[PDB]
Symmetry: C4
Subunit: 450 residues, 4 copies
């Protein structure tokens, strides 16, 4: 065997089947409308159509060999897959899109390729590929815009073909509206035919209108309907363009809107230009160093038993340098990684101060912190990455003259990325295995006596 739709093989086949479906959606109508296209390159159209039909057949086979999830397990029983396929509307659409209507080439002649129009009924495969690509691609907005542009181009191409067909029905050159006479040297070339039809279609759907006005009632009606199709469908698609660009700007726009609200508040309250500059510097840091997004709000949509792995694969850089995690229990790190709230501190920010509520443990992910003196400048100890502080005031200790108080003040030399671990959480998670707690308050007593 089976293909496992989640796999890469299924996605690759989705591409390989979208190619014929897109080809069919573009060219069947073109060949049906522009007769010279069908006739001049008939030897190539036959090859391409037969290859497309072969790929359609192989796609039907793949649909027979693609497993589905019952009880969460991939069904691998062949006949079960055949039944699941045939019971779905997709099998009906596939049989309809693979009906050998090409036999009508013997009746209607080689000049009627619209018999292959049923081949469009595999559009679903194409759309599936798109909805898969949009999910799996690393450039979701580039692909989304390319998809919208493809839809625009297909719509304009189809409307060009429709215009040319209507000109044919009315008669080429019978009036100033229809496509001019084919017998003209310049206006008889297939290139000119298609490109002028596309020009007309673009002017009509984009509602520019710089085309000869209608002459007949059918022409007036078609032009009204087509200008309305233009207005509505092009507003739809080119406003989807707008929404895609909006969601492209979503993060940056939200960040900038927050900054603007802050600046409005500061200018209204006449906040000192010192503090205004400090705030602007904080936000410039958040942007430049790519910290505007908070991983919590993003990863909250992941499963906890997958977001856990995510956090581990991101923070194993530091949670191996820490003494508590991955050293004593070697598994405890998972119990708290999904609750280590990542904070960022500016240069000179006092994370801790003597005589404060010690309700948070900190793990230094990045940055240089200092166990300073209360004078403000004298740096007693420099804590680099992997260090952990703020854990002594969490625990119950014998001989602690300072209970629930910070034993020292910790300031940040530079921008520090820390993991604030709350006291309640450390309490709750160390209950399972105190084999790490013993050396934890080993460190605790050792630092509390000195």
């Amino acid at each position: 065997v089976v293909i496992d739709p989640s796999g890469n093989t299924y996605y690759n086949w989705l591409f390989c089947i979208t190619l014929p479906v897109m080809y069919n959606w573009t060219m069947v109508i073109a060949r049906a409308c522009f007769d010279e296209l069908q006739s001049d390159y008939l030897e190539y159209w036959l090859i391409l159509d037969y290859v497309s039909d072969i790929v359609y057949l192989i796609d039907m086979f793949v649909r027979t060999r693609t497993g589905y999830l019952e009880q969460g397990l991939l069904v691998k029983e062949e006949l079960k897959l055949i039944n699941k396929y045939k019971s779905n509307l997709q099998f009906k659409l596939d049989v309809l899109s693979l009906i050998p209507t090409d036999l009508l080439y013997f009746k209607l002649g080689w000049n009627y390729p619209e018999i292959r129009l049923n081949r469009l009924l595999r559009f679903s495969r194409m759309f599936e590929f798109f909805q898969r690509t949009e999910t799996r691609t690393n450039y979701p907005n580039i692909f989304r815009i390319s998809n919208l542009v493809m839809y625009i181009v297909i719509i304009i191409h189809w409307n060009a073909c429709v215009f040319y067909s209507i000109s044919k029905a009315i008669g080429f050159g019978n009036d100033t509206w229809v496509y001019p006479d084919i017998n003209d040297p310049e206006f008889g070339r297939l290139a000119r035919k298609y490109v002028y039809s596309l020009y007309w279609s673009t002017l009509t759907l984009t509602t520019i209108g710089e085309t000869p006005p209608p002459v007949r009632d059918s022409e007036y009606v078609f032009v009204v309907v087509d200008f309305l199709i233009g207005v509505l469908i092009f507003a739809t698609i080119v406003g989807n363009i707008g929404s895609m660009i909006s969601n492209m700007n979503a993060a940056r726009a939200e960040f900038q809107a927050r900054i603007d609200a802050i600046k409005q508040y500061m200018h209204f309250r006449n906040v000192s230009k010192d503090m205004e500059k400090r705030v602007i510097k904080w936000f410039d840091y958040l942007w430049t160093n790519k910290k505007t997004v908070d991983e919590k709000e993003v990863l909250k949509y992941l499963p906890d038993k997958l977001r856990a792995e995510i956090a581990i694969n991101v923070h194993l850089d530091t949670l191996k340098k820490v003494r508590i995690f991955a050293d004593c229990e070697a598994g405890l790190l998972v119990e708290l990684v999904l609750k280590l709230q990542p904070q960022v501190y500016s240069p000179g920010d006092y994370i801790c101060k003597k005589g404060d509520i010690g309700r948070e443990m900190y793990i230094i992910k990045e940055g240089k912190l200092a166990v300073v003196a209360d004078d403000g400048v004298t740096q007693f100890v420099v804590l680099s990455d992997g260090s952990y502080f703020g854990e002594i005031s969490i625990l119950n200790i014998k001989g602690s003259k300072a209970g629930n108080r910070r034993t020292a003040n910790i300031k940040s030399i530079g921008y520090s990325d820390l993991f604030c671990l709350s006291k309640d959480d450390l309490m709750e998670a160390l209950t399972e295995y105190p084999d790490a707690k013993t050396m934890l308050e080993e460190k605790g007593k050792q630092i509390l006596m000195k």
Copy 2:
């Protein structure tokens, strides 16, 4: 009896009255402006107008026979309904729209059907039908787009009629702007008249402008006002189109935006392509198997005493296979169905692990789980649908060497849809009837000894 507006009969009548109202809103102005329309098909217009008026009268009768809610009860007293009708502005509008202005046909002649313009004053019924359909239809966006297209078409039709009337007032063919001379063979046909007027209207309201420029001051003024009506009203309607397409994409766009934020985080943090593929697979599963929507956020707008029924009608498939619910008390299932949080687990995800906080009971809705050994591969027990686990570590038990600990580790073979029932909730809800609890810890002791 009375009609009970909530019923299907009332909605069917809403359709049957919207038909004449729509007919009146489309055709009265057309016949008033295009005199040949009124004259040539007068025998049909008379029949249709009289049928419309009869339906208007029957709609007034229905309004007299439609109950309203006082004290939440449907008023069935006839005279009370007559008073409620006559006291509402709707009765005034109905009498105004049913005034026999057709008598003016004897004074103004058969060439003045705008006397029936008062018939438009039942627009409310039409709109009511729409606002009912949008609520009750299964295709809300299809109907909404059809409604907007109907508004566009009606506006363009009315503007075409207005253009033709203005041409008539100025005189057909008196200058290049107005509709050409009626005496022309081609430009005198009612078909050509209406269709060219519609063409002009479309070019003006869509602001394409490929029409002969005005000549007189009245023409310049009307064209300015009409181009502005075009800009404003068509932006309104065709931006409502945009918002409707947006809300069509709302679920998919939110899902894809979450996926994009996740992928941005993973690529920025250089998350391993293993875990990136796992996350993409999780999201592909959520989409393909239609799990992107969380029933909680959707059904939270339902009444609890209706959302309860909803959850029952959805989850009675599994809550009959469970041993606790619908078996001992047979009513307890409602006390917890509105708090069974549905979770989804990937293949191989450890739902439970030995030595963890047993604070959640799980009911396997769909999927195969395994009571494995801690080695990781040896599957002791396979739990299929209807099974419940994680309930032993919830309860107070005699002789439990493992208190508040998982007696075994449960992993998911495939994608498991479970119902996580919190410990606090099971505690709170079993307090009412311990007739099920006794066999609950029957199972508990039986599994805790073996």
Copy 3:
């Protein structure tokens, strides 16, 4: 005083000063550009300009006599108000807009009314009136759309005047682009002048372009700049139109989106058409009876000491029929009115059932409820409006064989609007005055014995 800007007198004056400001913003540029406008109606323009200037002077006086809030109190000291006025930029703008530039009529002649262009510098007053109207009017969206249309019209009018002025500078009729020769009988009329200039302006700003193309470099540059002004500013304004219509649809669109999510869930889960019809009926009820909006989310932006008055003025209809409130303490009703959560129940919905957690007291605002038998049909007692139930299981009672249990089952005959009062809240709020509690458990014992 003083005038007290919050008062109605200040708003009326805002209108009376917006009239000259709007007049000045519309007509000064018109008279400056269309010389015939200035000249032909000079006797009227002089009167209107002098009246506008008098009103400007009276507006300056009002600004001297309008109090401001210092320490939250309206300043009534005259000289303090004069200082507050003169210290503001508004005084500078007012003196600039009232500078007697009309004296230049003696130097530049009566054909130069753009000397009155400084009169536009009172635009602020106009805008203030708008921002006041939008706040105080009952039709905020009608006024907002009218304001946007006024901006559109003013922009188009100004661009028409600019086009005519540029034609004058280049010379009327010197090329096909500029306004045609004034000496023409038809193209020399002030009506034709202004209306064709407005036509050109509309075609340019709405970017239709059906105007003679530029000839000179200045014309090309102006047309480029004006088409870009068109694109940008008209997108701005006519997209503000879109956002205004969106916020017009905001409530209805949110309601309908909730209904659509519900219907999607129900159709996906194959919810029985019984329950689907019940849900659709619930939502039809919510809409038809105007219950889609929840007063909590709306009134949460009001002050509690004003939202309290709001809730009182709305619910004094029923909280006078209740026995506890406005009867014993006569002031207790305010302590709980801001926490009476309004619920709606469908016909047949069991609000209470025997043997359930009695943690909510209910006050029947509207609707008929029944104290039924557990059989389901036998109605023991019918509770109409003003009745209160679910209070016995809240209180501590002697001789209650049923503790924390519902003494009877309450069902809703029809759609009941109730006030669910939580047990914790009744406990917390009755602590202040048990003078009502005594008769409360009077009723309690009386019903618990029978």
Copy 4:
């Protein structure tokens, strides 16, 4: 060293390098396409190009001398900065944009300035400056709109240059579509050349289309592609304009939407016009006095150890007049400034009333309050700014006949801005230093006895 990108020097250099990048992005294509531009002002183009290249070199030097943050510290080691630069793609782009392609002037002649097209590869610097300006400027929306207008102008300019180049390739005047013959006196001027090309570009990108239709297939194709570029890219940019105006209106629109929901509720519930006027007055006050924004929601994105400084720099005006803060401990004010919830009370609003739950302490930021008698009018004490009340009922006091009760009723004479400090918070924060608490209940006893 180093430059410290957060500093003002780096931003100034960002401007000084954006000037050549913008110059290059505007003029290289212009000179490449309009040959007369390159030739006539070659002496000036050479100077400007060499100055631009010198500034590019100095920008490369700056990039070598700009520190980056490792461990949150600004790297000042020269060679480390050289490595960080050369290891980034920016160094590749800078070397590519500074390659001396001007040497090709000796081969291709002075008429080929597109060899300087590589100079566009420093676009990043320009964009960086923009993203810095948008952050640091006080007019974020003005700058954003200016940036979008710059993008529009650059796109139109580039498309004008492209049109002129295509006309050159096809041949000037070979058909009606291309730019006319250069040999024409009027259509040969560089001014006319560029300005008509810009006119064509504006008509095409804004999709007005009032230009001669294409003649050749290449012209038709280019016009189709360019009209589509117009539609898509101009919708993008001029809808970004819409979103920028939306976020300009965001605060005012949210405020007005809240007011509209309130007014809809009040008119639907038939709220008395007294209370409707009171609510409208409250909202008029909120707007006029600039209180629609709540500093909590804005400043919650700031760091707590920066939002603290913000609140201090804003509220030190009053927290120096208070007796508790900045007087006894002199540091306690920071422990509670981030939890002082700012409330606003209308004139006559009873903040406190005798016999109520004293769970909030109030600090009068602005406004006159009264310790009144319960009669309602007799004002015992007038509390101005700096005063604090509601603190007696917070504390545990000996001899308090009124426990957890308000000792008096406090009403607001005028609009009072207060700081509501919750009881729990005062309890929690005074635990650290009771040196202020002693005089706190000094005041407490002193007022409780009298």
